[model samples]
Target chain A: LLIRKLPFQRLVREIAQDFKTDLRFQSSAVMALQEASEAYLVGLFEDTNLCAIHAKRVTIMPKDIQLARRIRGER
Target chain B: SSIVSLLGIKVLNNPAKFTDPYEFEITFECLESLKHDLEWKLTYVGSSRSLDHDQELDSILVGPVPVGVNKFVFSADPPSAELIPASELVSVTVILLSCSYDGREFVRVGYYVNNEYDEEELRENPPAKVQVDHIVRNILAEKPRVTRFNIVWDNENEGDLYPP
Candidate 1:
């Protein structure tokens, strides 16, 4: 069963390949990374949406994203 | 000066089960008719130390407010269990109710919520699986922290006073 439509299998192995030449990836580990990434993205987007709500704007604007990113402490 | 002022709030379904939705009946006064909708939001603070841990439970808009007292019930689903840290499940947390007008916040009311297992054994020794039915949520209604902010009320000069 697919948790998401996006394919993470290839990308997961690609990143691991950079760490070692003969590295093998576990299916469970790959799925775990995918789940964590999806949850993080959901949270980030929810926060960004709240920025819009606080500004009294329904549409998500660049200012909202920038504000959320700043509050997230990202450079 | 702000056009809208919070009069009072009554916590509905108090001392509810963990699985029960949060409910509150809010009362406020509008000095004059408003040109726009009054924005109200309910937020559940997942963690006190970090803003990132906070969750926006729900938001609503109320309009066509007449001069004098007004009341409405605002309810939202409980915070997602998976999103909250398991270690903090049985501790006291905060929930905030805020209102805004013309894109500016004017007032915020906060309350403390305590989540715990009712049984003696579970209260001392928690289990890995969260017992939603067994857990109880108590909102400290007596000590609500109310804060007011000054914001420009753009409704005074606006011409849309008469609803279409």
Candidate 2:
């Protein structure tokens, strides 16, 4: 009749740790998407009339799915 | 110049007791007309088991298929790239999907060169004109939930921990 409490505790702790990790990952993914989109939009809406040289600065940053989802509110 | 379909299947885990395997498919239209070497990649995130067991089955490449219609398959097995085992993989499937296109062909060239001109100067900024708001909106509308598992075992004896 030996009892093992450590395994149970480990399982509980593992679950909690996993949940937190996943949430953080999701949040980071969303943030990345947002930044990428912002960069791209800034590029798109750039004042092309300013100058050809200035227009070169306009660049589109590809949005990752997470940010794309966030901008879209999918996440 | 062409569009193709990349079809693939991913086995989440080894000894994976799931009833069905997850299937992912996407279409990629090449940016050949843009004069840039564009390629698409798929990123898979899985638990440690599947990631560790079959080292080579991690990721797959379906491109250089050109911009037209093409189909490809991906599987989770050996001889594929190795992914971290049981690490809870999150697969990100990306394809060029579409390129900037105007009614006429060969209007604009390189991505960097084209960025220097105004909308009036270039034939069309297809990517810029694309209403990704809808794409993002659709994804958000169908928010996907992650698949998870909860294992619970109990013992009948006062101090017995084994469950059968």
Candidate 3:
């Protein structure tokens, strides 16, 4: 939930090298993080909605564990 | 725009012209928009007079502060942007400045953001010794034409205990 410290110099070196080699790695990581965060926030909000729907006898499908797992890994 | 001053236009011939190193003050007005803390990547490219080489240098500084005014500075040997036989023209480029919350991804503000670096990968493949040599060679090949350039961080942009 919190990153108190970061290994900076090491990250820069790694990123630079990656930039020089696999160009797609940079974009892929960004997209992955963004999507992961979006899904997570949406899921949290959806959970609140589900509670209301269940109180009214509305049926709800089970959440996708695979998608949740992917989000967790990315986060 | 009106014609201002042309009094001494043709008076001086081959007179010494003074040039100062390029300095820029960048202010990130939207620091709050950043998802994580910021950092910097400076890249220098120039031409040199060395018959055997050109010059290009890439330096990365992480955890740059946002909010206030920041100045980045760079200094080199020669002083012109022209590719002289023994002269070097140096220009510093603010390549990247962005932030990462958990050190997993870096996001740039004006530019594209991404996670090109991760902790586990860095531990597995540390900066290779050959990599430094390759960097030096690449810089030499570019042969920068100027001598000095700098980017400094200033004002509200300054923060405390930024990670190296």
Candidate 4:
């Protein structure tokens, strides 16, 4: 199934709580964010698998994802 | 001889948006009952020049298979925008679906994917920041490149394919 919009909308609202309740997202904008989030996850898993492969292992460990984020230059 | 053979694959959503999930329905026939699971991998080749850019978007295990035609739908999120270089974003790339038994890969199916902006203005003069939602990804499903490899199916030919 495709990603549902309502949950993503709730997530946007939750994040917006840090800024202000006045912030609003267009339907299209929310959809864009949802798509981007999915894409980000896809890439993250890709990197995580690569890390596991580098370790000569078939299973992905928690550390693999951490290492992937590190390789992506994220703090 | 191989224990499994691919019959066909159907691209679920064609000309999908950049943010859309990559979906495919794979059909294959099992010559005999498999004791172990079949490992299927869907990979995105970020760049043709290097393996470093390749991304294993998703992998799944289809197991407990019987001797017959089996089918399943595999879906993965599109490749991340941050990982792919801007230049390659709009260019043609390859996506591969591979099946392996035990630890040996047997067959690989590759498709050419073309990504381009939907808007004429964006197509002509792309902006500094990519509009991910505006980009369209078209996978050339009909003209797929399918490659098969000869590998040891059991312990009988183990020494032939792999050195002790």
Candidate 5:
């Protein structure tokens, strides 16, 4: 499936709005958030890919994501 | 001792554990082992000031938090605003009014210290906005929220977000 991304600009806007909040988006702050989010997604897929490969399957399902997160020590 | 002593107090200022963002909690501890009903009042100095929007906080609350042992609890909603909303990290001054077992009352102004704050530092240069979403994310792969609102204070003033 084609995965949709949380656009960097959208994230930036959200960050900015969050700050204008009771919020703003700094490049540094946005960068860090994107970095963390990307890292999490990457890890999620990395482990899910392995989960699929281990099962000799191509389609990554909800179970694969759940299993991947579980194996990664996520709650 | 024969006299009941004031042991400790706090604003119950934890963002994660605090169930109601609109409500803030205050806790008081007493030294004497006794059944003492407590009543308290407060002032909320809520502000919309932030890195994104710099303004003063004119804060306000309801509810109770467990002080664990024999600590008494009080909650207040001393503020209401159209232009000031809830942000993940915003500073608000809280004033506590205390009442005794016999209903004698005392009042004092208080500060909610942010970051790694010294006693006077928050009174001097208080910080805004703790990175809550990010902090919580480290616990899991979380997402930012939807269904939040904002407020515009004035020409250069905009407000914070609040929940449903």
Candidate 6:
């Protein structure tokens, strides 16, 4: 069974590798940020979907994403 | 200037599990008049499903809703749930049924999962239940008038979320 954990380890490890300097990455901050970022994404999606509800579309499109991001100043 | 009140639901203890027995403290301030009594309903709202599939796990009322600028705290032991606020499991929720005057009717307004423990941690600390907190807050962005009945979520152009 594939239990989904935050792609956290791999994702953060990727970024840290860019500096290519530290074999030692802090697990604490990455783990926490992983959760925080997901929550932020959910919030972003919620707002975006609300807009979709407005246009009466069941599917949330890229336009909805861009507009939602813009509304939240993420764009 | 009109009086604006602030209120919060604080989760206490290591309360875990949907069947866990715990008490939440309700705190509020700037309620100047005892004229309008406030009552609370602790609802276990299950979202993520179709709106029709959503559930209000418990519809129990809680109160002694006080008055006016004085910070007050009341502890309530919920009557019931099948969701844990701090579970490292599926997303579950406890939402506000409504904040009514004279504790009657009119008013306001998700769930995110396994990280449920994070919410309990935040509630135990700060920005608790941040998502649901914000959702309900948006329902209260501005103060309501002394007007009777549902003013915000009326049959108006705005207020309708999934407009019919």
Best model per TM-score: 4
Q: Against the true structure, candidate 1 has what lDDT?
A: 0.71
Each model's RMSD to truth, in Å?
Answer: 16.1, 23.5, 23.5, 19.3, 22.2, 19.0
- The candidate that wins on DockQ is 2
Return the TM-score for each candidate structure.
0.62, 0.22, 0.20, 0.65, 0.26, 0.35
Chain A of candidate 4 gets a TM-score of 0.83
- Pairs of residues at least 3 apart in sequence or in different chains that clash in candidate 6: B30-B69, B31-B68, B31-B69, B32-B68
What TM-score does candidate 1 reach? 0.62
| lDDT of candidate 3 over B1-164, digit per residue (tens) | 11111111011111111132222233323333333344333322222112223222223343433433334433322222343221121111111222223242233311110111123444355442212111111011111111111222232454535544
Report the lDDT of model 3 for residue B134. 17
Arranged by TM-score, best first:
4, 1, 6, 5, 2, 3
What does TM-score give for chain A of every model?
A: 0.68, 0.30, 0.32, 0.83, 0.64, 0.74
Model 5 chain A worst lDDT window (10 residues): A66-75
Clashing pairs in 4: none
Q: In order, what DockQ does each candidate have?
A: 0.02, 0.03, 0.02, 0.01, 0.01, 0.02
Report, to 2 decimal places, the DockQ of model 2.
Answer: 0.03
In model 3, what lDDT does residue B133 have? 15
Q: What ordering of candidates by lDDT runs from best to worst?
A: 4, 1, 6, 5, 3, 2
Name the 10 consecutive residues with the lowest summed lDDT in model 4 chain B: B155-164
The residue-by-residue lDDT of candidate 5 on B34-131, one tens digit each, is: 33344444333233132222222222221232333445444433233333344423322222233333233332333221112224544355446433
Output the better candidate (2/6) by DockQ.
2
Candidate 3 Cα errors over 4 Å, as ranges = A1-75, B1-19, B31-36, B47-164
Model 4 residue A68 lDDT score: 49
Cα error, residue B145 of model 2, in Å, equals 11
Lowest-sum lDDT 10-residue window in model 4 chain A:
A66-75
List iRMS for all predictions.
12.2, 17.1, 22.4, 13.2, 21.2, 12.6
lDDT of 3 by residue, A1-75 (tens): 221123433454477785686433464565555566566667644543332232232433222222122212212
